[PDB]
Amino acid sequence: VNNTKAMKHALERVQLPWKKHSFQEHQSVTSETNTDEHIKDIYDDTERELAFYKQSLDAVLVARDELKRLKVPFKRPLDYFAEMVKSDEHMDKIKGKLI
């Protein structure tokens, strides 16, 4: 029932020391604003997805600027073919295309 002292100790035991190392270790970006404005109605679909979208895309531009500075290849090449999470037949059928 909100033992803040123990959750504080749990965080310190368990967190990795990210400041002593490079952004590539974690690739995580925390937003500055609460993503709580951008939503006038918690129960409107298109409103909250837009906020989610915004928070994520802001995190991606930040992440690309940092991985560029670190010389870590970023964008998936159009001609790099590795196993994807969905098949190409699945993608083509979802778009109603001829395979």
Place this chain on the structure above:
Amino acid sequence: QFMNKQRTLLISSRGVNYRHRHLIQDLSGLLPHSRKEPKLDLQQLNEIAELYNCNNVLFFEARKHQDLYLWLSKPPNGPTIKFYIQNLHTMDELNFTGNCLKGSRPVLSFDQRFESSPHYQLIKELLVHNFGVPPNARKSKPFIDHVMSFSIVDDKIWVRTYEISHISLVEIGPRFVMTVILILEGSFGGPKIYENKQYVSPNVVRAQIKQQ
């Protein structure tokens, strides 16, 4: 090498839905550091994680063939988060036209709200270890393909998965909503150091709807 090393035990109880099974499969593809094991008291998950040498557990608990809970822990000393998962939509589904590399390392986007209270700050760190992909794990792939986002709306954690286009975004799935139920000191044991007073079980909710 790198400082961030993670191996996550990915395991479920008996009784998971078809929809539940799909999410497990989605996370297994999205997390090359996960190790999917045969199905599973809950203290016995510390031994199983030591068998497969995992320092995290993602345990999906299904009840009544419809309610899905996620238990996230650090075996064998803890802590443990218990979440109630709702609004589940797997990457299977019609309106998700994003695709990404199986095993590429995602960007993680966190709401500023995660820095707002001690229980959110502990969850944030734990989600990074589990839903981030460690550099440069066995079965991981190069290039940055997609983002997994976490946002706090009506004190629930809303999770989305987006493919990075070129730069715009297109949703992959899966998609779901977690609400924190409790936090245990230990790993499926020890005292509760957090309880959500706003959480109510879906079995009570289903009953109060019958009562009309």
